[PDB]
C-alpha cells in the first residue's frame, strides 16, 4: 500500500500521497453557509459549501475558518473539511491508507487527542502519525542542523535543531501571523477611503496583500521617499471595478512582523525572537545555527524579507559571524515536501500508531514515545 500525507495547516489545506514531489490538492480551509433566504424552488441548494467551492459563491456566504491559531475551534467544520479532502479532492478511501498529519508546537494535548480519535473512529484509518511542522520543513530543506522559522497564516514559531537533536527549551512561539497582517491591512486601508468589513471582502484584502505588499529594507528611508515621491503607488482591480491605488500602505502592512507594536502586541519582532532563540541554545552550536537559518511558510514569501532579516540579525549578532539565510522558492509547500520525504522512509514504517495500539491504550497513546 501507499501512505497519505495530509497537512491541515491554517487557511490552506494541502494533501497528497507520500512519495510525490508536490501536493495534489491545495484549497482554502473555509466552510460557508448561505445567509439569505432563497426564492427559487427546485434547485435545492445545499446547506454547507466547503473548500474551494465556497470561494466561487463568496458573495452570498459567511466564510468561517474552523481554526484560529493552530487550535481547532469548530470540530464539525473540521470533519467537513477532512471528508471533502478525502473524497472530493483525492477520491480515495482512507480505509486502506495510513495518514500523516502535521501539527504546530506548543498546543493543547486535547487537540491531538481529538484529532487522533476522529481519524480512528470517523474515517477508520488503519494507522496514523502526528509530526511537528518545523521538523518536516528541515527535512525538505536538505539540512540536518539550523534553526527554522515557520510562519504560516495561523502562528509563527522557531524550532532549533542541531544534528537531529531538538532543543525544546529554546522553542519560541509567536501568535502573529498572516491573518493579523490582513486585519491590520484592513485597519490601515480605511485611512485612505476604502472600507472592507464583510467576511467576503477578507479574501479581497488578502489577495491585495499577496499581490502588492513587500518588506522594506529600511523603514524611515522608505517613508521619507514615499512622502515626496509617488513612484511607490500601484493600482489594483477589484472584482467589480473602481481601481484603488495604495502608496506607503503596501510596505507598512508586513512591517508588523518586525514591529509588532503596530497592532498592540507586547512581544518583539521575528528578527529578535530568532536571535533570542539562538542565544537560548548552548554556546557550542550557535555558529552552526547562525550559518543555517532556514525559512518556511507562506508568510515568509514577501519580497525582500530575507535581506531585511539578514540585516537585522547581522546587526544583533557579533561582527565575526557569517549570517546566511536559506529561502528556497518553494517556502509555502516546504512542510508538505518534508512530510512526503518522512513518510517515504522505510525505517518510519514501525513508528505508525496502529489501530490495535489505539484500541488497547486509548487516545492517550499519542503522547507516548510515538510523539
Amino acid at each position: 500500500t501507499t501512505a497519505l500525507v495530509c497537512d491541515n495547516g491554517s487557511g490552506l489545506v494541502k494533501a497528497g500521497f507520500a512519495g510525490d514531489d508536490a501536493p495534489r490538492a491545495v484549497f482554502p480551509s473555509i466552510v460557508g453557509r448561505p445567509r439569505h433566504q432563497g426564492v427559487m424552488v427546485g434547485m435545492g441548494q445545499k446547506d454547507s459549501y466547503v473548500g474551494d467551492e465556497a470561494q466561487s459563491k463568496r458573495g452570498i456566504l459567511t466564510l468561517k475558518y474552523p481554526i484560529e491559531h493552530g487550535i481547532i475551534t469548530n470540530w464539525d467544520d473540521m470533519e467537513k473539511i477532512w471528508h471533502h479532502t478525502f473524497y472530493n479532492e483525492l477520491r480515495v478511501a482512507p480505509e486502506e491508507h495510513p495518514t500523516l498529519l502535521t501539527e504546530a508546537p506548543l498546543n493543547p494535548k486535547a487537540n491531538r487527542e481529538k484529532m487522533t480519535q476522529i481519524m480512528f473512529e470517523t474515517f477508520n484509518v488503519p494507522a496514523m502519525y502526528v509530526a511537528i511542522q518545523a521538523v518536516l520543513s528541515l527535512y525538505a530543506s536538505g539540512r540536518t542542523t539550523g534553526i527554522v522559522l515557520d510562519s504560516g497564516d495561523g502562528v509563527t514559531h522557531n524550532v532549533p535543531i542541531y544534528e537531529g537533536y531538538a532543543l525544546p527549551h529554546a522553542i519560541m512561539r509567536l501568535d502573529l501571523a498572516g491573518r493579523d497582517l490582513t486585519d491590520y491591512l484592513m485597519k490601515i486601508l480605511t485611512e485612505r477611503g476604502y472600507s472592507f468589513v464583510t467576511t467576503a471582502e477578507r479574501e479581497i484584502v488578502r489577495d491585495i496583500k499577496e499581490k502588492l505588499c513587500y518588506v522594506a529594507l529600511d523603514f524611515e528611508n522608505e517613508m521619507a521617499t514615499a512622502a515626496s515621491s509617488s513612484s511607490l503607488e500601484k493600482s489594483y482591480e477589484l472584482p467589480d471595478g473602481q481601481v484603488i491605488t495604495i502608496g506607503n500602505e503596501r510596505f507598512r502592512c508586513p512591517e508588523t512582523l518586525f514591529q509588532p507594536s503596530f497592532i498592540g502586541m507586547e512581544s518583539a519582532g521575528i528578527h529578535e525572537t530568532t536571535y533570542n532563540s539562538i542565544m537560548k541554545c548552548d554556546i557550542d552550536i550557535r555558529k552552526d545555527l547562525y550559518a543555517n537559518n532556514v525559512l518556511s511558510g507562506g508568510t515568509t514569501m514577501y519580497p525582500g524579507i530575507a535581506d531585511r532579516m539578514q540585516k537585522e540579525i547581522t546587526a544583533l549578532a557579533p561582527s565575526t559571524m557569517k549570517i546566511k539565510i536559506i529561502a528556497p522558492p518553494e517556502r509555502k509547500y516546504s512542510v508538505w515536501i518534508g512530510g512526503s520525504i518522512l513518510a517515504s522512509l522505510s525505517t518510519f514504517q514501525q513508528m505508525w500508531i496502529s489501530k490495535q495500539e489505539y484500541d488497547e491504550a486509548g487516545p492517550s497513546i499519542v503522547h507516548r514515545k510515538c510523539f
Binding site: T2, K14, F17, G19, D20, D21, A22, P23, R24, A25, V26, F27, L90, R91, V92, Y139, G142, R143, T144, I326, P328, P329, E330, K332, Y333, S340, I341, S344, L345, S346, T347, Q349
Partner: protein
C-alpha cells in the same frame, strides 16, 4: 550486459511463423560511472573512429577522447576489437535495413549530444545557494544539435518548474542536484534510444504470419565475481540468484512429479526457502536494497552512516550478513554475503552517489516540444488512487527490482529448459585446461547446487532387471 530475449513464434499447424525479440535489465550505471580498469559501451569509442571524417566535423566532435569527461575516467582503449570495420559493418547493416539514412544520422547526432552533457559546468551565485552556469558554449552547441534553445534549457536545468494543485511554481537546485539531474537525463535518453531501436528492429523483422505458441530463448549475464565487487555486480548477482532459485523450484517440481509417478513420495519440504532466505535480505523491506534506497533520500547520508545502519540492522540479526574477510591483500572489503556461489564481499564506497536517478520534468517537456525525432523517445514520461513516485524519489535499484519482477511475471508462465556453456581454458590452445577456471565456471553455473540438492535425497535409481543381472550373483 542486457538480458537479450527472443521469442520464436510458430504457425497453427506447428510450422515456423515469425520471431519476436525483447530486451530486459539494461544497465544505466555503465554510461556515467565506470571502473578504473574497464571501458564504457563500444558506441562512443566506435564513433571516435577517424576513418569517417564527415561525422566528426559535422557534429563538431573533439577527436581526442581524453578531453571528454564521461569517457576519460575509465580505461581509454584496449585491443579488444578493431573498431573501424566493426563500425562500417554496423553502418552497412543499418543501410541494408528497412529505414533510411536520416534516422542513422539522427542516431549519431543524438549520441554526440549525449557525449557533450559532461562538459556542462555550474557555479554558486552572488549571495545565494542557487547555482548558475559559467560556460555556455557547450550548452549552445548541444541545444543547436537537439534543436532546442540554450537559454530555455539552462533555465529548465537551474529552475525546474513543478505543478502544485492548480498552479505552477519554480523549484531551486544546487550544484549537486543539477549534476545528478544531468546524469539522469543522459541515462534516460540512452535507455529510450535503445528501446526505440529494439522496437524498430522487431517491426522490421516482423512477418505477417500468425503467432501461435512460441519458444523463448533467454540470454543473461553470469554470476560474475571480482575482487572489487560493487553495485553493478551486486544487481547481476541478485538477478542470477533469483534465476537459480527459479531453477531450484522447477527441479523440485520435476522431482515431485517423478516421485508421484513412481509412487515413491517422501521429503515434501520445498527446496526454495533455503535459497530465498538470502533473497529476503535484498528485495524485502528492511533489506540491503531498501536501506540503500532510503539512505540516499536522507539529505545528509554518508557511507560511514550507511555501513553503520547495515551493521545495526543486519549483523547477528540475519543469518546471511556477516563480517568481511581480508585475503591476499585485497584493496577493500566492508561486508560479506553468502550465496549459492559462495562468499562474496562488496565495497560500499561510491554506492550512494550513483544510486540516485532524479529526472527533470521540465527538460522532458522541452524535449517533447523539440523539432527533432527525440520527442518520439520521450513521448510519455513522468487522483482516484495514485502512487506515482516523484522525480526525486527515483532510484536505479527500484527500477531494477521492477524490471526483474515484470520479467518473472513473464518467464514463470513457460516451461523452462537450461543450457550451460563452460570455457575449458583461459588460453586459445585446445586441449589444455585451467582447473581454477573450470571450478569458477561450475560454481557460477550452479551445478554444485544442483548436485547438492540431488545428494540429500536418493540420486541413484536402477531398474530391478539391471540390478538382478548385475547384483544377483552376490547371493
Amino acid at each position: 550486459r542486457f538480458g537479450k530475449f527472443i521469442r520464436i513464434h510458430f504457425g497453427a499447424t506447428g510450422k515456423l511463423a515469425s520471431a519476436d525479440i525483447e530486451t530486459y535489465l539494461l544497465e544505466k550505471s555503465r554510461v556515467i560511472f565506470q571502473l578504473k580498469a574497464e571501458r564504457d559501451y563500444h558506441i562512443f569509442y566506435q564513433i571516435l573512429s577517424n576513418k569517417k571524417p564527415e561525422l566528426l566535423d559535422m557534429l563538431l566532435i573533439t577527436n581526442n577522447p581524453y578531453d571528454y569527461a564521461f569517457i576519460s575516467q575509465g580505461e581509454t582503449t584496449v585491443a579488444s576489437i578493431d573498431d573501424a570495420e566493426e563500425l562500417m559493418a554496423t553502418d552497412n547493416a543499418f543501410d541494408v535495413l528497412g529505414f533510411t539514412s536520416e534516422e542513422k544520422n539522427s542516431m549519431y547526432k543524438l549520441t554526440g549530444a549525449i557525449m557533450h552533457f559532461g562538459n556542462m559546468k555550474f557555479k554558486l551565485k552572488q549571495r545565494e545557494e542557487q547555482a548558475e552556469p559559467d560556460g555556455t558554449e557547450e550548452a549552445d552547441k548541444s541545444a543547436y544539435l537537439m534543436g532546442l534553445n540554450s537559454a530555455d534549457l539552462l533555465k529548465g536545468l537551474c529552475h525546474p518548474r513543478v505543478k502544485v494543485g492548480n498552479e505552477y511554481v519554480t523549484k531551486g537546485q544546487n550544484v549537486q542536484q543539477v549534476i545528478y539531474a544531468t546524469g539522469a537525463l543522459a541515462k534516460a535518453v540512452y535507455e529510450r534510444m535503445f528501446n526505440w531501436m529494439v522496437t524498430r528492429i522487431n517491426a522490421t523483422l516482423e512477418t505477417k504470419q500468425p503467432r501461435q505458441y512460441f519458444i523463448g530463448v533467454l540470454d543473461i549475464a553470469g554470476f560474475e565475481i571480482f575482487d572489487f565487487n560493487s553495485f553493478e555486480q551486486l544487481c547481476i548477482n541478485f538477478t542470477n540468484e533469483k534465476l537459480q532459485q527459479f531453477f531450484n523450484h522447477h527441479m523440485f517440481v520435476l522431482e515431485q512429479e517423478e516421485y508421484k509417478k513412481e509412487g515413491i513420495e517422501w521429503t515434501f519440504i520445498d527446496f526454495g526457502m533455503d535459497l530465498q532466505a538470502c533473497i529476503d535480505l535484498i528485495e524485502k523491506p528492511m533489506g540491503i536494497m531498501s536501506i540503500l534506497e532510503e539512505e540516499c533520500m536522507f539529505p545528509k547520508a554518508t557511507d560511514m552512516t550507511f555501513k553503520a545502519k547495515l551493521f545495526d540492522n543486519h549483523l547477528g540479526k540475519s543469518a546471511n550478513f556477516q563480517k568481511p574477510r581480508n585475503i591476499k591483500g585485497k584493496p577493500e572489503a566492508h561486508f560479506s554475503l553468502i550465496h549459492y556461489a559462495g562468499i562474496v564481499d562488496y565495497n560500499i564506497i561510491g554506492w550512494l552517489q550513483k544510486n540516485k536517478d532524479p529526472l527533470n520534468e521540465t527538460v522532458v517537456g522541452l524535449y517533447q516540444k523539440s523539432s527533432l525525432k527525440l520527442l518520439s523517445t520521450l513521448f510519455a514520461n513522468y487522483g482516484k488512487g495514485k502512487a506515482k513516485k516523484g522525480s526525486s524519489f527515483q532510484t536505479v535499484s527500484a527500477l531494477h527490482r521492477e524490471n526483474l519482477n515484470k520479467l518473472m511475471t513473464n518467464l514463470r508462465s513457460t516451461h523452462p529448459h537450461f543450457v550451460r556453456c563452460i570455457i575449458p581454458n583461459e588460453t586459445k590452445s585446445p586441449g589444455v585446461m585451467d582447473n581454477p577456471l573450470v571450478m569458477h565456471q561450475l560454481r557460477c553455473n550452479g551445478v554444485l547446487e544442483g548436485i547438492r540438492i540431488c545428494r540429500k535425497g536418493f540420486p541413484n535409481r536402477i531398474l530391478y532387471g539391471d540390478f538382478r543381472q548385475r547384483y544377483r550373483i552376490l547371493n
